[PDB]
Design a protein around this ligand. Structure first.
Ligand SMILES: CCCCCCCCCCCCCC(=O)SCCNC(=O)CCNC(=O)[C@H](O)C(C)(C)COP(=O)(O)OP(=O)(O)OC[C@H]1O[C@@H](n2cnc3c(N)ncnc32)[C@H](O)[C@@H]1OP(=O)(O)O
Ligand SMILES: Cc1nn(C)c(C)c1CCOc1c(-c2ccc3c(c2)c(CN(C)C)nn3C)ccc(F)c1F
Ligand SMILES: [Mg+2]
Length: 382
């Protein structure tokens, strides 16, 4: 298999055996000042997401044209407020919210984003960007517009002095640094079956299925409570120390910890364990991301919670995640999703997750290093 675009890029070849560590190519000391050329009739536009009208335009583009499941039954439905959380963390830049519009109608038809992040990869720490929300309108697919988006965001990142990036995708490209499977924990099995997200087992009745997945009405862990402002420093401390055991991780500042974890309703939830001495010893977090259910007369939307970062030092991880499930059910979610990264394999089967169909691939741009098992991956992108 050959890759017309990716073979030109500074990433290793599929099937390459990698035993070194470092950049694929040297930093560039002169950078192209002009935007790359788009097909006739289209134009670049940097989106001011602080403008409510423009934010709505981006919401609509993704709602109608972003990621679907392998069976074209479900599509991500990121909320406007969620998009602000994901796209304006500390250090964000407006030129890195890179849109494509139709010149005559002004209709938004393409997008790609970068946000800054410090990344720890094996024995090196590097200022990088995270690339996300690449999207091309359904009517423009298969016209080689995506390589233009990728080159242009690459150019604009270069201008700010950054020459490495990290990203994830479902498709196989040159060349994965890690491969994760996603798993799903049923919370509202009757609905999941009716919309064909999952199927009734041939050796189980619906009645048995509902009882199999029933949860406690309240969490077990003593001292569990929502994260507060006073917890920001200790949460930062807990996260930084916990992440050292993995090989691909973010390195967050205290301000970045506040952004990514301080609770925002219908976006991000974080709960800490404050013990008998008043000490915070653990925390769990998950983000809110529904999926549109397409072509269905009665059910319109699937409510899903996604496991984020979970740190344990005194409470068992199994107990922590059990409480996470209970909280999601209480808050009205239909399903709780988790990847098989970090230590997650220790609890997925015990807590009745079922394996999904598909991979999430992890990638680095312009950095050569050996691949790693999923258990060594310690980074999560929205
Ligand atoms: C130093 C700074 C560096 C910064 C940049 C770092 C790299 C960033 C990389 C981006 C990370 C994004 C992370 C996320 O956001 S992952 C989410 C991706 N988005 C979606 O799945 C939304 C639904 N799909 C679409 O909107 C379109 O199908 C997209 C836009 C995905 C492709 O549009 P289209 O289907 O009309 O195709 P084309 O004819 O224009 O172009 C075909 C070429 O594009 C390659 N392709 C297809 N999908 C992806 C993909 N997800 N990553 C990388 N490459 C991809 C493909 O192999 C082929 O190249 P080659 O096979 O000929 O070689
Ligand atoms: C539910 C649902 N609705 N839709 C429309 C889909 C695909 C799903 C499966 C979601 O799968 C995941 C993903 C996960 C899997 C694949 C992904 C993604 C997330 C993302 C979003 N970020 C990570 C780029 N892009 N891609 C291709 C990440 C973590 C999980 F726990 C999952 F279960
Ligand atoms: Mg295209």
């Amino acid at each position: 298999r050959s890759y017309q675009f990716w073979d030109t890029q500074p990433v290793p070849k599929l099937g390459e055996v990698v035993n070194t560590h470092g950049p694929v190519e040297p930093d560039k000391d002169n950078i192209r000042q002009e935007p790359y050329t788009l097909p006739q009739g289209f134009t670049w536009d940097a989106l001011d997401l602080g403008d409510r009208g423009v934010l709505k335009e981006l919401y609509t583009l993704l709602n109608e044209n972003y990621v679907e499941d392998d069976d074209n039954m479900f599509r991500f439905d990121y909320s406007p407020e969620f998009l602000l959380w994901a796209l304006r963390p500390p250090g964000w830049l407006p030129q890195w919210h890179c849109g494509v519009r139709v010149v005559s109608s002004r209709k938004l038809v393409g997008f790609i984003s970068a946000i800054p992040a410090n990344i720890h990869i094996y024995d090196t720490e590097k200022k990088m960007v995270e690339i996300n929300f690449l999207c091309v309108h359904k009517k423009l697919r298969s016209k080689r517009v995506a390589p233009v988006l990728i080159r242009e965001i690459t150019r604009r990142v270069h201008l700010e002095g950054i020459f490495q990036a990290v990203y994830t995708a479902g498709v196989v490209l040159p060349k994965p640094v890690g491969t994760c499977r996603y798993w799903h924990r049923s919370l509202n099995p009757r609905k999941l079956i009716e919309v064909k997200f999952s199927h009734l087992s041939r050796n189980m009745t619906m009645q048995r299925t509902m009882k199999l997945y029933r949860l406690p009405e309240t969490p077990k862990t003593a001292g569990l409570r929502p994260m507060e402002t006073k917890d920001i420093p200790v949460v930062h401390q807990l996260l930084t120390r916990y992440l050292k055991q993995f090989h691909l991780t973010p390195v967050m500042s205290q301000e970045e910890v506040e952004h990514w974890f301080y609770p925002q309703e219908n976006i991000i939830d974080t709960f800490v364990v404050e013990n008998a001495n008043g000490e915070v010893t653990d925390f769990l977090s998950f983000y809110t991301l529904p999926s549109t259910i397409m072509n269905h007369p009665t059910h319109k939307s699937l409510k899903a919670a996604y496991s984020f970062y979970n740190v344990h030092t005194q409470t068992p991880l199994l107990d922590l995640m059990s409480d996470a499930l209970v909280l999601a059910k209480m808050k009205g979610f239909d399903v709780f999703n988790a990847l098989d990264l970090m230590e997650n394999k220790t609890f997925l089967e015990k807590l009745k997750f079922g394996i999904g169909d598909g991979n999430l691939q992890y990638y680095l741009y312009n950095w050569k290093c050996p691949s790693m098992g999923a258990e060594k991956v310690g980074l999560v992108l929205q």
